[PDB]
Every structure is written in C-alpha cells, then in structure tokens.
C-alpha cells in the first residue's frame, strides 16, 4: 500500500541500469583496445629480449595480418557477398506477403521498405574498399605470397627501453585504475544508492517529471564517469606516445645503416600493404550494419506474417 512507489523505484533503477550499461560498454571497448594493443605488440617479450641482448616488426605485422585475416575469414558474411541475394529473397518474401489487404498500413510499410532500400543503397557505397580488401584477405595463398614478396648507439636503446618500461607500467596502471573506478561505480549502485526514502516530492503525478529528480540523482554519478573517461583518454595518449617511442626504439634496434633505396622502397610498400588492414576493420564495422539491417528486414517479414493472419 501502495505499489506505485516500487514502480517508480523500478523506473529509476532501470535508468541507472541504462547509464551503467553505457559506461560499461565504454570501458569494455577501452579494455578491448588496450588488450588488442598489448597482444599485438607483445611488449613484455620484446622488452625482455631487448634487455637480454643489451646487457621483429615483421613478426608483428605477420601476426596482426594473420589475426585480422583469420577473424575476417571466420565471420562468413562479408566475403561471400551473398547478402545482397539474401536481401532480394527477403524482398521476394515481402512481395509474397503483399499479395487482399484494404488499408493504408500497407503503403506505410511500403514507405518503410523504401527507407530500407535507401539504407541498402548507402550500404553499397562501402562495398568499394571492402570487396578488394576482403577478397585478397580471404585467400591465404595470395596474402602469404604478397606478404612474402615484399655500435655506440646501445645507450640510446637502453634509455628507450627504460622509457618503454615506464610507459607500459603506466598503461597497465591506467587499465587497473579504470577497472577499479568502474568497480566502485557499480558497487555504488548495488549498495548505498539510497531508495524511495529520498522520494518525498509528493506522490509524483505522474508523467510531469517525476523525471527531473531522476536526472538530478543521476547527475551525481558524473564524478565516476568523468574519472573513467579521463583514465581512458590518458591511456589513449599513453598508447600513442608508447607506440611512437617503441617505433623509434624498434627502428634504432634493427639494421639502421641503411641502403639500398630499393630496400626502403620495399619496406614502404610493405607498410603500404598494412593499410589494407584498416579497410578490413572498416568492413568489419560494416558487417555489424548489414546484420542489423537483416534483423530489421526479418522483423518486417515477421510483421507481414503477423499482419496477414494473427
């Protein structure tokens, strides 16, 4: 007596759950990025090896290209290009569904279909960079063939190594700091996040806000989210600087003589072929769009099935 209080509380809890979901998505993306970096670079074994030889980049590029190509190959959706034919099939299904209705909700559905068609047209624009990259990536033979085709400076290397160590430790500490930051934010919702005892502003109305109190109560969560974003950006520039310094150290460690001009040109070509990976990532990002569009299409088809005879 009554149950409305628990309803409002449930609503506020839902909002809080949404915010925590957003923040968790952000930190998850950050952690995934840093983990991908730390996995690709292998900074620990590189530092250990360099330190051992004191007192390769090609292996890295091979590992990253192999991982990207394998991941792209596994998700059998982008390479096949059968999705357009599938869309045509879905269109045929919708055509069959459209074939004794006498209302204007069919024309509206047609308009929605038109919008989906426009979305498909927009989807076509990204096919240019995708098709060339993905097809050359799908073949192990071609990719392997193309990939295969292409003192007193010790103290500097040592200093660079030290800087790399400090940078790495700073990065790990940043990740730990973010994880703890979240841990406290989530632990703040499953603990002393108050209740309906603060809900003394009458018995709402409702629908007349009623929501300003929720926004206000949510606005005190800002100092944790801001700390999360701060640690994320800091780990961002940390990642950039560490990448730069490690690139310099890796360029000072190897040959460095150098010659010939065809050598630097070939290396340049190799670094050029690594720009395909970017397009691969882009096509991966485009994969999550075609999936959503197929979901909407299937939803529309099921909607037509229901509208036919529910």
Contact (CB, 8 A) for 34 and 242: no
Say how far apart CA 236 and CA 165 lie, in whole Å: 17
H-helix or E-strand containing 101?
none
What percentage of the chain's residues is helix, strand, coil (to nearest 5)?
A: 80, 0, 20
As given in the structure block, the two tokens for residue 91 are 């269109």
Q: How many residues does the chain have?
A: 310
**3-state SS class at 6:** helix
Say how far apart CA 237 and CA 174 lie, in whole Å: 11
Contact (CB, 8 A) for 62 and 264: no
- In sequence order, which residues have a C-beta less than 8 Å from that of residue 268 and are 6 or more positions away? none
Say how far apart CA 105 and CA 48 lie, in whole Å: 68
Instruction: Give CA separation, 303 vs 42, 97, 98, 298, in Å.
Output: 50, 10, 12, 8
CB atoms within 10 A of CB 200: 8
Contact (CB, 8 A) for 42 and 22: no
Contact (CB, 8 A) for 90 and 298: yes
Method by which this entry was solved: X-ray
**Residue 102, phi then psi, degrees to nearest 5:** -130, 25
Which residue intervals of 126-211 are DSSP H helices?
129-138, 140-149, 154-189
Domains and CATH numbers, the chain: 1-55+151-256 (1.20.120.560), 62-150+257-310 (1.20.140.50)
Which residue intervals of 99-150 are DSSP H helices?
105-125, 129-138, 140-149
Say how far apart CA 74 and CA 287 lie, in whole Å: 12
Say how far apart CA 234 and CA 22 lie, in whole Å: 20
Among residues 309, 217, 307, 260, the alpha carbon closest in space to that of 16 is found at 217
- In sequence order, which residues have a C-beta less than 8 Å from that of residue 177 and are 6 or more positions away? 231
Among residues 190, 193, 185, the alpha carbon closest in space to that of 231 is found at 185
């Amino acid at each position: 007596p009554f149950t409305e209080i628990y309803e409002k509380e449930s609503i506020y809890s839902e909002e809080k759950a949404q915010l925590l979901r957003k923040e968790m998505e952000s930190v998850e993306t950050a952690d995934l990025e840093y983990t991908s970096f730390v996995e690709f670079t292998n900074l620990p074994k590189l530092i250990n090896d360099l330190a051992a030889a004191y007192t390769p980049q090609l292996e890295m590029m091979r590992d990253q290209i192999k991982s990207w190509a394998y991941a792209v190959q596994q998700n059998e959706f982008n390479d096949i290009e059968r999705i357009i034919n599938v869309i045509s099939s879905k269109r045929k299904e919708i055509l069959d569904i459209l074939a004794l209705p006498a209302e204007e909700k069919e024309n509206i559905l047609k308009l929605k279909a038109s919008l989906v068609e426009a979305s498909q047209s927009d989807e076509k624009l990204f096919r240019l960079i995708k098709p060339y990259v993905a097809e050359i990536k799908l073949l192990c033979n071609d990719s392997s063939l193309w990939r295969k085709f292409d003192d007193s400076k010790t103290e500097l290397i040592l200093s660079k190594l030290k800087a790399i160590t400090q940078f790495a430790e700073d990065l790990r500490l940043l990740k730990e700091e973010r994880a703890r930051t979240m841990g406290e934010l989530k632990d703040y919702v499953n603990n002393n996040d108050d209740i309906t005892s603060l809900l003394l502003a009458n018995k709402d109305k409702s629908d007349a806000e009623l929501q300003s109190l929720f926004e206000s109560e949510l606005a005190k969560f800002e100092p944790l989210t801001t700390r999360i974003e701060a640690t994320i950006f800091k780990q961002g520039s940390t990642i950039n600087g560490v990448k730069i310094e490690l690139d310099n150290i890796f360029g000072l460690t190897g040959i460095q003589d150098k010659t010939p001009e065809e050598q630097k040109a070939e290396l340049e070509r190799k670094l050029f072929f690594d720009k395909l990976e970017e397009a691969t990532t882009k096509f991966t990002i485009f994969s999550s769009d075609i999936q959503k569009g197929l979901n909407f299409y299937n939803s529309l088809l099921k909607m037509s099935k229901d509208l036919q005879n529910s």
